[PDB]
Structures are given as structure tokens and as C-alpha cells.
Amino acid sequence: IVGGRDTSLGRWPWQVSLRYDGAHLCGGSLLSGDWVLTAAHCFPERNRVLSRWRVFAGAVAQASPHGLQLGVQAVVYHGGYLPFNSNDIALVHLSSPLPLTEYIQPVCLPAAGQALVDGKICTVTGWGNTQYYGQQAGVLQEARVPIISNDVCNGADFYGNQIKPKMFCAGYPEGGIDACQGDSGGPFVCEDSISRTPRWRLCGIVSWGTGCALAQKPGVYTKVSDFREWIFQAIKTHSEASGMVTQ
Amino acid sequence: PLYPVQVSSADARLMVFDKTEGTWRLLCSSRSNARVAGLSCEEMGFLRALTHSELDVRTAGAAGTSGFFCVDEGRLPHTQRLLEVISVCDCPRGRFLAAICQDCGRRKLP
Numbered sequence: 027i028v029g030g031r032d033t034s035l036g037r038w039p040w041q042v043s044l045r046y047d048g049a050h051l052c053g054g055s056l057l058s059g060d061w062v063l064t065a066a067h068c069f070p071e072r073n074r075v076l077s078r079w080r081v082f083a084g085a086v087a088q089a090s091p092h093g094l095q096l097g098v099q100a101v102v103y104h105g106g107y108l109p110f111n112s113n114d115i116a117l118v119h120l121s122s123p124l125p126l127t128e129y130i131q132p133v134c135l136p137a138a139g140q141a142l143v144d145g146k147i148c149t150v151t152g153w154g155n156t157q158y159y160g161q162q163a164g165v166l167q168e169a170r171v172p173i174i175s176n177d178v179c180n181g182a183d184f185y186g187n188q189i190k191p192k193m194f195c196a197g198y199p200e201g202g203i204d205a206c207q208g209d210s211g212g213p214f215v216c217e218d219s220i221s222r223t224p225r226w227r228l229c230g231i232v233s234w235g236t237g238c239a240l241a242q243k244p245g246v247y248t249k250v251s252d253f254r255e256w257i258f259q260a261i262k263t264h265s266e267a268s269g270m271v272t273q
Numbered sequence: 274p275l276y277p278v279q280v281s282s283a284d285a286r287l288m289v290f291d292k293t294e295g296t297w298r299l300l301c302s303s304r305s306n307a308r309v310a311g312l313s314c315e316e317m318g319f320l321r322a323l324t325h326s327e328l329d330v331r332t333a334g335a336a337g338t339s340g341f342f343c344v345d346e347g348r349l350p351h352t353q354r355l356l357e358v359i360s361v362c363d364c365p366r367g368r369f370l371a372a373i374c375q376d377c378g379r380r381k382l383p
């Protein structure tokens with residue numbers, strides 16, 4: 027995350043770090059004690075031995091001895107993810123569930139029919155680079171960015187028609203604050219009180235962008251509302267699966 | 274901007290908005306309670322219903338609802354949205370559904 031700030035324990039309790047052979051590669055969001063929602067592109071051919079992945083939760087410092095690390099039982103990625111950029115979404119089933127504590131909590135999904143509010147300012151978090159030619163963050167970072175309309179984002183001066191309908195952009199025309207390499211798969215959350223209580227919901231999944239924090243090249247996210255049914259199905263369908271599977 | 278489907282934090286009873294009245298109605302208990310509880314939690318953005326039970330208006334009260342809605346159990350399994358298989362009804366047994374959905378989106382620090 028470029029242009030963000032260090033955050034503290036318990037603030038974004040759904041954030042997890044997905045590590046392969048010891049390195050942090052992607053972010054992810056807990057949907058329950060044993061299911062994580064992330065991006066499909068975090069599982070290229072060279073990173074598909076489930077035994078080599080670990081999910082780290084409950085700490086904001088990557089080197090905290092107090093976080094919990096569990097294995098992966100299965101990964102279900104979207105079959106429509108043609109690179110295997112639309113449908114850049116996947117579900118990760120942990121081998122055992124995490125306890126839910128004041129530091130580990132799931133995030134909510136958008137309600138049926140709930141649409142993105144253009145202009146609304148949401149939060150994006152992660153341990154990715156704080157500069158494109160920089161290093162990953164030691165402590166989880168958070169930044170607030172507004173949702174941009176697809177009309178603006180698909181214009182010739184932004185991403186000239188590369189934003190498909192199940193993805194959206196968030197950022198400032200001016201650049202300066204954005205997600206970056208190492209943040210892929212993590213959360214883009216917006217808070218609302220439609221259930222009469224303020225709750226944070228996962229509206230987007232960090233997916234891609236050209237460079238990081240450049241003006242007119244905002245970050246692009248997978249629009250979670252469009253995959254609600256895919257998620258509900260996948261979990262039912264594969265609760266007892268092991269391996270890389272597609273839905 | 275309330276969502277048409279709500280769950281009570283006092284006793285988890287489900288409430289569904291009735292736009293012709295501007296009131297919330299309870300969901301009459303039926304043999305398909307498990308699927309209705311599951312579908313209601315999904316609808317609202319929760320992952321699943323952890324459990325559900327049946328309440329009795331005579332022991333629990335109405336809690337500010339006006340009537341009942343009943344689910345067309347035959348159409349139930351063809352839906353994605355609760356509101357399209359529901360109708361006002363009398364619910365003679367005066368027993369309604371309560372659903373405990375998986376909690377989410379809230380910090381638990383002091």
C-alpha cells in the first residue's frame with residue numbers, strides 16, 4: 027500500500043497473509059474461521075502445492091510470533107479466470123478453522139442487491155510494497171480511497187476500455203494512494219448500517235493496476251457483489267474438497 | 274436505507290419489510306425453516322445461518338411487527354431472494370423463525 031499508514035491490532039481482524047515457501051505473496055479476507063476469499067492470480071502454476079502455502083492471521087507485524095499459521099486444504103478458483111483479468115477470485119479452505127477472537131473476525135459480504143456507491147471512500151489494507159520499487163511493509167498498512175465510475179476509469183486517459191463489468195477502480199485521479207504488489211487478494215471494505223448496526227463488508231478484492239499510485243492509473247478490484255452466488259455455491263459444493271479445483 | 278430483511282439482536286427473530294404497510298412482518302415457521310434461515314442470512318450478507326429456532330408470539334411477543342409472511346415451500350428451492358416466495362398469511366400457530374447467522378464485519382476491541 028502506497029501512501030497509507032501503519033494500523034494496529036484488531037482494527038481489520040479479517041485480514042490474513044497468504045505465504046508460499048516462506049514469503050508473503052498475497053493478502054486475503056476471512057469469510058469464516060476456515061474460508062478465505064482472495065484473488066485467483068495468487069495461484070499460478072509455480073505456486074500450486076498446497077502443502078507449501080500457510081495462512082497467517084491475528085497479527086499486523088509479519089514477524090509476530092503471536093499470529094496463527096494454518097495450512098490449506100483446498101483452493102477453488104474461478105474457471106472463468108481465462109489467464110488459467112475478469113473473475114480474478116478464489117476461495118481458500120484452511121485445513122482447520124481459526125478461532126475467532128478480538129483479532130480474528132470474518133468480514134461480511136454485500137447484501138443481495140447491494141450496489142457500490144461511486145465516490146464512497148472505503149479502506150484497502152495489506153503488507154504489499156509501500157513504493158513500487160520499495161519493499162513490503164513490516165506492519166499492516168491501511169489507506170482510504172474512493173470508488174471511481176467505470177465511465178471515468180475506461181476512458182482513454184485512464185485504462186481505455188480495460189475495465190470489464192465485474193471489476194471497478196478506486197483511487198485518486200492524482201495518484202499518491204493505492205494498493206501495490208503484495209496487496210493482491212486482499213480487502214477493499216466499505217462500512218454501512220443497513221442491518222441497523224455498522225458493519226464492514228468486502229466490496230472488492232485487490233486485483234491489479236499499472237505501476238502503483240500513478241495519476242490516472244487507479245487500482246482495479248474484483249467486484250465481490252457479482253460473485254455472491256459463486257461463493258455460496260463453492261463453499262457448499264467443496265467444503266470436503268482437497269486440492270486446486272475450479273468452480 | 275434499511276435492508277428489507279433484518280434479524281433482531283435481542284432474540285434473532287427474522288423481520289421482513291412489507292412495503293404496502295411500511296411495517297416489518299415475522300416469518301411463519303414451516304417445515305423448510307432450515308433453508309429459509311440459510312437463505313435469509315445469505316441475503317443479508319452473512320455467510321450462513323449457524324442455527325435457527327422457532328419462537329412463540331405468546332411467550333416472546335411481536336416486538337413491533339405487524340403480521341406474518343409465509344413461504345411458498347414449493348417455490349423456495351428455485352430462489353436466490355427471499356422476498357419473491359413470500360406472501361402475507363395468518364400463521365395460526367403463532368410460531369415464527371429466529372436465525373443465528375454467522376456474525377461479521379465488527380471489531381471486538383474495547
Ligand SMILES: NC(=[NH2+])c1ccc2[nH]c(-c3ccccc3[O-])nc2c1
Pocket residue numbers: 204205206207208209210232233234235236237238239244245246
Ligand atoms: N497498483 C495496484 N493497484 C496493484 C494492486 C495489486 C497488485 N498486485 C500486483 C502484482 C504484481 C506482480 C505479481 C502479482 C501481483 O499481485 N501488482 C499490483 C498492483
